[PDB]
Structure formats: C-alpha cells, structure tokens
Amino acid sequence: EEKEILWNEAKAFIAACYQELGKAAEVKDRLADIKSEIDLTGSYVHTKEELEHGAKMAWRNSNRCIGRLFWNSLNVIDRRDVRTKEEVRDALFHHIETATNNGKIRPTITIFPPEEKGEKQVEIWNHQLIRYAGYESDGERIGDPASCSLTAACEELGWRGERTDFDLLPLIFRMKGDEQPVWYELPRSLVIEVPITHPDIEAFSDLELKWYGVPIVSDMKLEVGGIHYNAAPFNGWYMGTEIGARNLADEKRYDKLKKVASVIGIAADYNTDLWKDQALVELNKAVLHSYKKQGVSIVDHHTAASQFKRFEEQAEEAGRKLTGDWTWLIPPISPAATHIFHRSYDNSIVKPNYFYQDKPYE
Amino acid sequence: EEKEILWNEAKAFIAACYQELGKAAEVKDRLADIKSEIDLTGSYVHTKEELEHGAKMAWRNSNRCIGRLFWNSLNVIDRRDVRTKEEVRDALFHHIETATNNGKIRPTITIFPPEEKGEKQVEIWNHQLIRYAGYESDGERIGDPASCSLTAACEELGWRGERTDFDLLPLIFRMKGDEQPVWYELPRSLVIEVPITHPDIEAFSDLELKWYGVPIVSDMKLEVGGIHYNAAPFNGWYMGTEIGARNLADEKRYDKLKKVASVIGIAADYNTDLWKDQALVELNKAVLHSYKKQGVSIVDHHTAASQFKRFEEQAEEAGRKLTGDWTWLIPPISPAATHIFHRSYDNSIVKPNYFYQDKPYE
Numbered sequence: 001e002e003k004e005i006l007w008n009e010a011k012a013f014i015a016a017c018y019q020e021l022g023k024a025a026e027v028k029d030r031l032a033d034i035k036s037e038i039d040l041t042g043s044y045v046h047t048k049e050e051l052e053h054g055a056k057m058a059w060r061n062s063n064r065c066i067g068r069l070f071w072n073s074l075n076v077i078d079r080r081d082v083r084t085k086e087e088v089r090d091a092l093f094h095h096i097e098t099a100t101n102n103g104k105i106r107p108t109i110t111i112f113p114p115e116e117k118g119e120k121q122v123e124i125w126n127h128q129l130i131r132y133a134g135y136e137s138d139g140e141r142i143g144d145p146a147s148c149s150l151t152a153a154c155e156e157l158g159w160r161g162e163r164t165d166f167d168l169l170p171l172i173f174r175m176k177g178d179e180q181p182v183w184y185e186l187p188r189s190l191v192i193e194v195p196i197t198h199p200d201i202e203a204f205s206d207l208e209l210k211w212y213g214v215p216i217v218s219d220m221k222l223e224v225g226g227i228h229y230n231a232a233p234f235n236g237w238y239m240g241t242e243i244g245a246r247n248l249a250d251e252k253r254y255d256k257l258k259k260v261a262s263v264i265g266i267a268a269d270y271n272t273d274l275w276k277d278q279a280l281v282e283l284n285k286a287v288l289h290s291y292k293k294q295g296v297s298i299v300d301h302h303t304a305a306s307q308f309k310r311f312e313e314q315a316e317e318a319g320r321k322l323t324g325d326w327t328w329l330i331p332p333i334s335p336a337a338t339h340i341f342h343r344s345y346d347n348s349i350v351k352p353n354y355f356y357q358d359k360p361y362e
Numbered sequence: 363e364e365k366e367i368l369w370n371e372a373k374a375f376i377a378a379c380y381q382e383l384g385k386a387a388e389v390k391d392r393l394a395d396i397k398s399e400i401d402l403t404g405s406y407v408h409t410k411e412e413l414e415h416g417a418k419m420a421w422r423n424s425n426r427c428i429g430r431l432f433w434n435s436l437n438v439i440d441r442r443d444v445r446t447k448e449e450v451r452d453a454l455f456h457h458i459e460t461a462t463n464n465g466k467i468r469p470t471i472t473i474f475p476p477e478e479k480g481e482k483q484v485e486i487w488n489h490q491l492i493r494y495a496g497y498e499s500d501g502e503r504i505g506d507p508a509s510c511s512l513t514a515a516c517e518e519l520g521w522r523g524e525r526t527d528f529d530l531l532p533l534i535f536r537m538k539g540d541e542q543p544v545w546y547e548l549p550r551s552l553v554i555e556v557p558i559t560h561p562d563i564e565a566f567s568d569l570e571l572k573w574y575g576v577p578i579v580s581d582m583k584l585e586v587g588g589i590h591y592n593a594a595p596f597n598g599w600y601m602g603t604e605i606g607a608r609n610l611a612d613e614k615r616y617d618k619l620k621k622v623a624s625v626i627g628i629a630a631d632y633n634t635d636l637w638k639d640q641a642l643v644e645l646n647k648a649v650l651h652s653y654k655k656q657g658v659s660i661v662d663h664h665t666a667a668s669q670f671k672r673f674e675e676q677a678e679e680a681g682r683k684l685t686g687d688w689t690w691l692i693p694p695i696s697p698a699a700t701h702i703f704h705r706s707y708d709n710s711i712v713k714p715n716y717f718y719q720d721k722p723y724e
C-alpha cells in the first residue's frame with residue numbers, strides 16, 4: 001500500500017524540483033515515468049540532477065541550520081553505485097579528503113544507496129566521520145563523554161583506543177546481510193587537527209587543547225521525494241561556538257572552563273565575577289584564532305548570523321516561506337547580539353530534509 | 363452571560379487556593395457565598411487572604427520568569443480602597459519606597475481596584491514606575507528609544523524632559539471618568555540610581571552610565587479567579603544581564619557596546635575578535651560590581667539559574683506541574699552554561715497569572 005506515500009512525496013518533490021530548475025514542462029513526462037516505475041517496481045530512482053537538487057533543498061529546509069545561505073553550492077557526490085565495504089570505506093575516505101581540501105573546506109555530501117524495503121544497504125554507526133573516543137571506567141573520565149557508547153561498541157568489535165583525550169574513533173558501518181559492522185582506522189594523513197592557542201595569552205597552550213578540522217555528520221537520513229537515504233554523510237565548516245562554547249565547554253563534554261580561567265589568570269570562585277563568561281569568550285577567541293592561523297575554514301557566530309540574515313532576505317525575494325528553529329539558530333555565546341534572537345521563526349518541517357534515526361548501538 | 367466565565371475561573375481558583383492554604387474544608391461554603399454573590403451582583407470580592415495567595419500563585423505561574431523560587435515571599439499591598447488620583451499617586455510613591463527598602467529590595471506588588479464591567483478604575487500608562495525618557499527628533503537620538511512613544515505622550519500633556527540620556531519619566535495614569543491621565547514628577551529622593559563603574563578598569567566611568575535600582579513593572583494585568591486587576595504594579599530585583607546585556611547593549615536601546623570596547627581598550631573592527639562578546643562580559647561585570655558596591659540588590663544569571671533549578675525541584679516535590687518559556691528563561695549571556703539551556707519546558711498558560719494589555723498611548 002505504501003506506494004501511495006511514495007507517490008505523493010514524489011509528485012510534490014518533482015514538481016517543486018523541476019520548477020526550480022526551469023524545467024517545469026518536463027514534469028508531466030517525468031512524473032508519468034515515475035508513476036509507471038513505482039507500480040512496476042515499488043520504488044523509483046532519482047536522476048543525478050534530481051538527487052543533487054534534492055540534497056540542496058534538504059539543506060535549505062534544515063530549520064536548525066544557521067549556515068543555509070550557501071545551500072546551492074553544496075558539492076553532491078553520488079555514490080549509489082557502491083556494493084562493497086571496501087568501496088564504502090574508500091568513499092568515506094575520499095569525502096574526508098575532498099571536503100577538507102587542505103583546509104579550505106568544501107561543503108560536501110556523499111550519497112550512498114537508499115533504503116529499499118525500509119532495508120538499509122549501508123548503515124553508518126559514526127555520529128561524525130571524524131570524532132574523539134570517550135571512556136568512563138571506575139572514576140576515570142577520558143576523552144569525549146558524548147562518545148562513550150560508540151567507543152564501547154567499537155571496543156566490543158576488537159578495536160582498542162590509546163585512551164588519550166583525543167583518540168580518533170575508527171570508521172564503523174554495517175553492510176546489508178552482514179550481522180556485524182566492520183571498522184577501519186582513519187589514516188592520520190587525512191585528518192586535519194588544530195591545536196588551540198590564544199592570540200594574546202601564551203599560557204593558553206598549556207591546556208593542550210585541539211579539535212578536528214571538519215565536522216562530517218554521518219548518522220542522519222536524507223529524505224528526497226519519498227526516497228530514504230539513511231547513509232549520506234555531509235559537512236560544512238564549523239561555527240567557532242560549536243567547539244569553544246559546547247564541545248570544549250559543556251560539563252558533560254570536555255568541561256574546560258575552570259582550566260581556561262586558571263590559564264587566563266582570573267579567579268573561578270564567585271558567580272558575580274562572571275568567570276565562566278569571561279572564560280567562554282577567551283576560549284572562543286582562541287578557537288577562531290587557531291583555525292584561522294592554520295588556514296582551516298571556520299566562521300564566527302556574528303558573521304554566520306549576518307549570512308543567515310541574507311538567507312532570510314533571499315528566501316523572501318524568491319517567494320519561499322522561511323522556516324527555522326529559534327532555539328537552535330541562536331548561538332550559545334551572546335545570542336542577543338544577533339538579529340536571530342530578536343525575531344521568531346516558523347518551525348514547520350518541509351521536505352526534502354535531514355532527519356534523526358535510531359542508533360544501532362545503544 | 364459572562365457570569366459563567368467568572369464562575370468557572372472562581373471555582374478553579376478557590377479550590378486550588380484553599381487547598382494550598384490547608385483550608386480545603388472551607389471551600390464549599392466560600393464557593394456558596396461566591397456563587398450567590400455573582401448571581402446577585404455580577405462580580406465577587408476577594409478576601410485579603412485569597413488576593414495575597416492569588417498574586418503569589420500568579421508569580422509562580424509566570425513561564426517567562428527565572429526568579430520564581432521566591433514566589434511565596436511576595437509582599438502584597440492591598441490598595442483596592444483607593445478612590446482618588448492623590449491616593450493612587452501616594453500608593454505608587456509608597457510602593458517605590460517600600461520595595462526599594464534602602465537598597466535591600468523587597469519583591470512587592472501593590473494591588474489597585476479591579477475592572478468592574480471590563481471598565482478600568484485606574485489605568486497606569488507607565489511600563490515601569492521608574493524608567494528613562496526617550497527622544498528622536500531630526501537625526502538626534504537621546505535617552506531610551508523604548509520610551510519614545512510614552513515620552514511623546516507625556517510631552518503632549520504638558521510635561522517636558524530635560525533631554526539628558528536619563529530623564530526620569532513622570533508617573534502617568536488615568537482615573538475612571540477622567541478623559542485624560544494626570545502626571546506627577548517623581549521625587550528624586552525616592553529613586554535610587556547606580557553609577558556603573560568597573561572593578562578593574564578605572565576608565566569605565568568615562569562612559570557615565572547609570573541605571574535605576576528597582577524595575578517595577580506597571581503595565582501588566584494580574585488575573586485571579588476571573589477577577590481582572592489591570593493595575594497592579596510589581597517588582598523583584600534585577601538580574602544583571604537585563605541591564606548589561608539588553609538595556610545598555612541592544613542596538614535599539616542604549617547601544618553602548620562600541621563605547622565599552624573603546625574604554626576597555628580592545629579594537630571593535632573584526633567579528634572574529636569577538637569584541638562584542640568581550641564588551642558584553644566586561645559591561646555585565648561592571649553592572650554587578652556597581653549594584654553590589656552601592657548595596658542595591660541584584661542577582662547574576664548563574665546564581666539566578668541555580669535558584670530556578672531549586673524552583674523546579676520544589677515544584678516536583680509539591681506535585682505541581684512546572685511550566686516555562688525556554689526562550690525567555692535562558693539568559694542572553696552564556697545561556698549554555700546554565701542548566702536551563704539543556705532542558706525543555708512546557709509553555710502552557712496556568713492561571714492565576716500576569717498578562718499583557720494594550721497600551722493606551724500608541
């Protein structure tokens with residue numbers, strides 16, 4: 001019966017997509033072919049053009065994303081042809097290499113074969129292709145706590161971390177028909193890392209903080225015209241606050257504020273001193289300074305908000321409703337200094353889009 | 363017909379109120395009397411006990427308020443007896459004096475006669491009893507822009523501001539049957555002001571910033587058991603960010619960030635320098651430091667969030683649903699460093715409560 005759901009989502013997408021591509025006349029025939037294909041086969045296949053535009057539309061419709069101004073320049077890599085775990089591995093490696101681009105990050109998505117009967121062809125376990133492991137035995141806390149469950153799942157499969165605070169997790173994914181996923185260590189030559197130093201405070205390096213260059217989100221499902229691409233990792237470049245105000249600052253993450261306060265030479269004893277706030281700002285300055293110094297792309301939250309304002313304006317000129325999630329759009333540092341804070345946003349879900357899916361570990 | 367709306371709201375309130383007061387048995391008879399009073403007169407009158415508890419419940423139910431831990435210690439001044447503008451004026455003066463308490467601020471509400479037929483007995487035009495005027499003629503911007511419309515309305519009525527950046531607006535309110543409101547200049551002896559200095563940076567005083575001690579919100583309607591108290595000004599003490607991150611920082615308010623950056627000696631040229639963020643933190647440190655130094659009550663956003671966590675815990679122990687507006691509960695400075703940021707809140711409206719009402723100017 002599900003052909004009905006597939007059919008409607010397809011009608012809606014193909015009409016919108018071809019309309020945007022200036023190919024409004026080619027719809028009826030393309031729709032005919034699709035209608036025919038669904039009946040005969042239960043599914044349908046996107047042309048490279050449709051798939052590329054769909055991934056772009058999905059980014060455009062991501063309510064929680066401040067970086068959407070650049071939706072139309074997304075680099076879409078079509079890998080629906082992969083059949084083996086060696087090919088999947090090599091596609092993931094290539095994505096890291098091409099997206100990184102020696103530091104001048106290209107927003108990229110690699111698209112693997114979609115679900116057929118709801119059955120996945122490829123199931124990626126990583127939350128991001130590049131991320132640090134996390135450990136928690138008796139009392140001892142090492143690495144990134146957000147990574148504890150995946151780290152434990154990897155160690156079940158024969159991987160073993162060095163237990164530094166910045167162990168790179170291996171790529172881990174499962175192929176249809178395989179009962180267990182496989183894992184592959186990342187070639188360190190592929191992964192750019194940035195040591196965190198401060199522009200003015202030389203002691204900042206005593207913290208020995210670092211972070212990876214490219215956030216490549218690998219556990220969300222891309223949905224385009226009723227077709228479910230559960231494996232489709234994508235990346236942009238970082239907004240500094242993600243690293244400096246969350247990954248490094250959150251108590252349930254690296255929890256570094258008290259250490260930052262020490263090296264910048266302020267007391268961490270009184271709330272009224274705003275020592276957490278001062279620490280957040282210096283930490284966030286350091287992160288932007290370091291990435292810039294190393295020639296790795298990054299955006300600050302003010303510039304990012306200015307760009308998003310241009311996205312709003314562009315949406316309006318094009319006659320498209322704007323949707324957004326205010327609670328995710330505001331940055332976690334000085335939100336009221338951005339225009340985002342002072343307006344509201346319609347949080348409706350429009351497709352094509354990216355969605356959460358259940359973790360196979362946990 | 364409206365007696366029906368009044369009756370239900372009354373049943374709901376009296377049951378909840380007396381239940382909380384340990385007087386659950388006295389409900390049936392109190393309800394009987396009320397039912398009788400509504401039929402005979404169209405309305406009913408709160409006992410001092412009911413009114414006091416209702417105002418407290420209203421504060422408890424204010425989704426946007428982070429300061430709710432202290433709901434039960436609200437100082438309720440019952441002024442339903444006032445009939446003249448001299449009495450209203452003197453009640454407003456007294457509120458300022460008693461709430462201020464030489465700097466050790468008492469959360470206070472003064473309650474004036476409620477609406478009868480929807481007809482107001484007293485209509486207060488001030489947004490806060492103490493606030494600064496704002497002006498905008500050709501090019502020239504003086505004072506608080508948020509006050510422009512009320513300032514213009516006052517100047518229509520014969521008041522004239524000195525046009526400093528911190529002119530105190532007069533009290534302005536209208537009595538039933540009067541066509542125009544009256545206005546009275548505030549005795550400067552009643553109004554505590556705090557010069558903003560910085561703990562470490564002596565040049566900060568060159569900005570000549572100041573703010574008033576007590577925010578007394580005077581344009582919201584208190585609703586208790588179907589009874590509409592449109593005139594019921596209330597106050598707490600300030601959370602520093604309200605002054606330092608909004609009143610003084612917002613571009614549409616005093617817009618001081620660029621001037622702050624100059625006196626603290628950092629460039630205001632590059633977004634990646636996070637100069638706005640650094641300025642916000644120093645400005646906010648200054649505000650807390652100044653209030654504390656002068657012996658005027660104030661809370662920082664971290665301590666305030668810790669208190670609100672205790673409010674959540676207390677709500678749970680008492681078996682009361684918690685409601686809140688995340689978008690107003692998070693502070694505008696380092697929101698992710700508070701627990702509030704990392705949870706969600708049911709934004710349902712529960713009565714008794716405080717509500718917006720239309721401005722008579724504008």
Ligand code: HEM
Pocket residue numbers: 055058059062064065066067068070074107108109234235236237238239242299304328354
């Ligand atoms: C080009 C630079 C980009 C920047 C600076 C950027 C910035 C951000 C930020 C800061 C968030 C919030 C993340 C969080 O708070 O955890 C976000 C969310 C998101 N971004 Fe972007 N982004 C960029 C590119 C992209 C691209 C290329 C895509 C997909 C094609 C994308 C899709 C999303 C999605 C789906 C979310 C929400 C994820 C969720 O619900 O957890 N973004 N973005």
Ligand code: HEM
Pocket residue numbers: 417420421424426427428429430432436469470471596597598599600601604661666690716
């Ligand atoms: C005791 C110290 C108090 C503190 C520190 C405090 C803190 C705050 C803050 C920071 C806000 C947000 C204001 C904004 O962003 O514009 C707020 C909102 C509010 N507070 Fe409180 N508050 C306190 C006492 C009170 C009292 C005594 C009442 C009433 C009896 C009250 C009722 C409210 C209401 C109704 C709002 C929302 C106003 C609106 O929707 O615009 N608060 N509070």
Ligand SMILES: CNCc1cccc(OCc2ccc3ccc(N)nc3c2)c1
Pocket residue numbers: 215217219220235236237238239242
């Ligand atoms: C673990 N946090 C929840 C969760 C679950 C799944 C995906 C996700 O992604 C957040 C996200 C997604 C895309 C991004 C693109 C660029 C960027 N700089 N950050 C980005 C951050 C976040």
Ligand SMILES: CNCc1cccc(OCc2ccc3ccc(N)nc3c2)c1
Pocket residue numbers: 577579581582597598599600601604
């Ligand atoms: C002009 N801003 C919108 C608007 C309209 C009407 C009332 C209001 O009040 C905000 C408010 C209310 C009560 C408060 C109590 C204590 C406090 N420190 N701030 C407080 C701030 C805000």
Ligand SMILES: C[C@H](O)[C@H](O)[C@H]1CNc2nc(N)[nH]c(=O)c2N1
Pocket residue numbers: 326340341342343344689690691692694
């Ligand atoms: C309506 C819009 O979301 C707007 O930014 C609101 C919400 N957030 C806020 N939060 C606070 N503390 N104060 C405000 O005035 C506002 N304004």
Ligand SMILES: C[C@H](O)[C@H](O)[C@H]1CNc2nc(N)[nH]c(=O)c2N1
Pocket residue numbers: 327328329330332688702703704705706
């Ligand atoms: C669900 C809850 O409101 C929680 O704080 C959310 C919303 N705000 C957020 N905003 C960002 N940027 N990132 C997050 O992970 C979250 N978490």
Ligand SMILES: [Cl-]
Pocket residue numbers: 215242247
């Ligand atoms: Cl991240």
Ligand SMILES: [Cl-]
Pocket residue numbers: 577604609
């Ligand atoms: Cl205020």
